[PDB]
Amino acid sequence: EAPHLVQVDAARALWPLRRFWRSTGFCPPLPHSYVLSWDQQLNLAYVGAVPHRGIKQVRTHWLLELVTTRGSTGRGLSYNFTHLDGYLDLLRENQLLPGFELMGSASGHFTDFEDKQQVFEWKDLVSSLARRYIGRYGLAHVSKWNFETWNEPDHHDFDNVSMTMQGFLNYYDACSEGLRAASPALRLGGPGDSFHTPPRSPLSWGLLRHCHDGTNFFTGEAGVRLDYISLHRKGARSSISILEQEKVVAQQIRQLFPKFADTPIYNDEADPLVGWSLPQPWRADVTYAAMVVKVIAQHQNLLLAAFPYALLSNDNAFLSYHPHPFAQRTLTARFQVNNTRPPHVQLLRKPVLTAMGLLALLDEEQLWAEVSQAGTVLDSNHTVGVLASAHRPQGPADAWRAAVLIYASDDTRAHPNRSVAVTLRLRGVPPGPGLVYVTRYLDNGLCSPDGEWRRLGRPVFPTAEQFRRMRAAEDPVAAAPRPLPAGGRLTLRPALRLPSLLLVHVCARPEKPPGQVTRLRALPLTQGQLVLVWSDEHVGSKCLWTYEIQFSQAYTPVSRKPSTFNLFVFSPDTGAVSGSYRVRALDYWARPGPFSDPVPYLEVP
Ligand SMILES: *[C@@H]1O[C@H](CO)[C@@H](O[C@@H]2O[C@H](CO)[C@@H](O[C@@H]3O[C@H](CO[C@H]4O[C@H](CO)[C@@H](O)[C@H](O)[C@@H]4O)[C@@H](O)[C@H](O[C@H]4O[C@H](CO)[C@@H](O)[C@H](O)[C@@H]4O)[C@@H]3O)[C@H](O)[C@H]2NC(C)=O)[C@H](O)[C@H]1NC(C)=O
Ligand SMILES: *[C@@H]1O[C@H](CO)[C@@H](O[C@@H]2O[C@H](CO)[C@@H](O)[C@H](O)[C@H]2NC(C)=O)[C@H](O)[C@H]1NC(C)=O
Ligand SMILES: *[C@@H]1O[C@H](CO)[C@@H](O)[C@H](O)[C@H]1NC(C)=O
Ligand SMILES: CN1[C@@H]2[C@@H](C(=O)O)[C@@H](O)[C@H](O)[C@@H](O)[C@@H]21
Ligand SMILES: [Cl-]
């Protein structure tokens, strides 16, 4: 068993690296009017706390069931946007954007998209919505949003809404014109389905044909705007299978629809396995996290480094249910702790979520890298692979960086007995002030809250103490900053588990220390516990060791594992949580940034 050799050249910056994977999504349960519950508020706090904007978009189904109506077509029709405002504000509060599927019936009003009056009403609803949120958040903000068709139109998922082939095209034109009437800057794509071989997926292929050659319902004009094409293709447990399927569909689009040769393609349900709620042990831990990284690596290395692929979304923002808090396709593990007064909810950060924080350390340029075993060169379509990046500095709060993310993953298969010897030879590091490197490591032995849960006997309602034990496995194992050797080379010989993730971060020292933590808030969990959450928007550099939290009832530091996750659950052994909190960044050279404004918290008994 010859070791895997991973060579990286930090002088050879090859091309841009785009962070095309910063998306998640979910569907609310039946009936369609949850998204405003404390559970969801906590869930989106965890999603937005991934550092350095590591998750940006939350693709959310049934948004237009958050709109209700009064009156009627003949009486005079009014919309109540209150609940939609709530969800969108909640996203905004967490620095997230909706993947805005135009999906729903506005509480039973819309029934038939071949009914001429309804198609007109839809256009005006879409325009009203768009103008409303342009007013609420500014056009710059709303024009970042991916507006999209109704989810999976060929999967008959319409409630009491008749959506025939022709109805879908009318609906589309109403979406397209509605948005256009508000602003030409707004983006719309679709269909968000499989694109199986014809005669399958008629509404998906039909939409493309309509937009390429058909006639606009409202303007009679040939051709209709289509700013991106969204497909769904999942792996059936194979990672590389996702890409293979995407290439077939993308090639069929290129030849059949020449006007869409450059039209960006999204896979906004790019999951290892269909069926989020189906319990799978690999979904619980680093097996899934490493596979998600591998899928992304494959896409960067075997596709983008030429079809116009722009977005990949792991559809994993669902909330898990008893009796499978960890084993569902979710970023967090939900515990409904019913036996307190009152009942409360706790979430644990699962490794997949933690991995998104490692991916987020990748910067804007891809570096040359090569993996080989015994002299044979191995591309990312193998169990071990790599993604390496570099940062070009600008400011004095900034300096050169390299991030090298290595994965060991056999898709959904874990191999607890195996050890994979890896030699990382990093060469070409430009000279710079105070060059240091930091490792962060994840595997099922060291960083699996699921594993801790099972070691504790799978408590259905964990005690506070059991929760602390479980959370102690959330973060990666980090080695403190070490100076780089002289000469600009670094050679390391880690033993990786299968699965595992290792991020090697090499940073030059910026002239100035980190910026200020902002937007600190304290959220109640239960007597004796709260969540602290904040933004790293003005922190500057990614060369961060931890966030120092201080508490005052003189300010005292709160002792904890190092973490760059922009969220912390504070569950002191004493239950003493009333007082003031403040947080600051601590960088790799032990320099603090300035404290956040203090945030007071008074518990009510
Ligand atoms: C602590 O208190 C909480 C409530 O505050 C309880 O939470 C409920 O827990 C049960 C699980 O024990 C949940 O029931 C499950 O609901 C799932 C989703 O239901 C919705 O969505 C589906 C599909 O999208 C619809 O079909 C359905 O009508 C709902 O709208 C179901 O998918 C689950 O079904 C699976 O397992 C069951 C067997 O139990 C089978 O019947 C099914 O075939 C399927 O494979 C399941 O029914 C319930 O949703 C939770 N409620 C809430 C509000 O979240 C906790 O149970 C309680 N803790 C303890 C330990 O008692
Ligand atoms: C990824 O590697 C696999 C090999 O594991 C490739 O799939 C094989 O292709 C051969 C011939 O082309 C087929 O006979 C087999 O069905 C495949 N083998 C196995 C064991 O699955 C696949 O082509 C590679 N994919 C990419 C995108 O490079
Ligand atoms: C709109 O809906 C909200 C939430 O259901 C409700 O509280 C509010 O009063 C409604 N407004 C009107 C004008 O009906
Ligand atoms: C086909 N069904 C998948 C489903 C799942 O696999 O659970 C889930 O990701 C989405 O809510 C649906 O839009 C797609
Ligand atoms: Cl999956």
Residue numbers in the entry: 27 to 59, 64 to 335, 340 to 587, 591 to 642
Sentences from the paper on this structure:
Human α‐l‐iduronidase (IDUA), which belongs to the GH39 family in the Carbohydrate Active EnZyme (CAZy) classification, hydrolyzes terminal non‐reducing α‐l‐iduronic acid residues in glycoaminoglycans (GAGs), including dermatan sulfate (DS) and heparan sulfate (HS), through a two‐step Koshland double‐displacement mechanism. The active site of the enzyme contains a carboxylic acid/carboxylate pair that acts as an acid/base (Glu188) and a nucleophilic (Glu299) catalyst. Mutations in the gene encoding IDUA may result in mucopolysaccharidosis type I (MPS I), which is a rare autosomal inherited recessive disease that leads to toxic accumulation of HS and DS. The structures of IDUA when complexed with the inhibitors in a non‐covalent transition state mimicking form and a covalent enzyme‐bound form provide insights into its conformational itinerary.
In an attempt to fully define the conformational inhibition of compounds 1–3, raIDUA crystals were soaked with the ABPs for shorter durations. Data collected to 2.39 Å resolution on a crystal soaked with ABP 3 for 45 min revealed electron density in the active site of raIDUA consistent with the unreacted cyclophellitol aziridine 3. A methyl group on the cyclophellitol aziridine was visible, but the rest of the R group was not evident and presumably disordered. Interestingly, the pseudo‐glycoside was observed in a 2, 5B conformation, which is the predicted transition state for GH39 α‐l‐iduronisase. The majority of the interactions with active site residues were the same as those described for the covalent complex with raIDUA, although a shift in position of the glycoside indicated that the carboxylate group additionally interacted with Lys264. The hydroxyl group at C2 forms a hydrogen bond with the nucleophile Oϵ2 of Glu299, but at a surprisingly short distance of 2.4 Å, suggesting a tight interaction. This close proximity results in a distance between the pseudo‐anomeric carbon and Oϵ1 of only 2.9 Å. Superimposition of the main‐chain atoms for the two complexes revealed a shift in the position of the cyclophellitol aziridine to accommodate formation of the covalent bond. This engendered movement of between 0.2 and 0.4 Å at C5, C4, and C3, 0.5 Å at C2, 0.6 Å at the carbon at the position of the endocyclic oxygen, and 1.1 Å at the pseudo‐anomeric carbon.
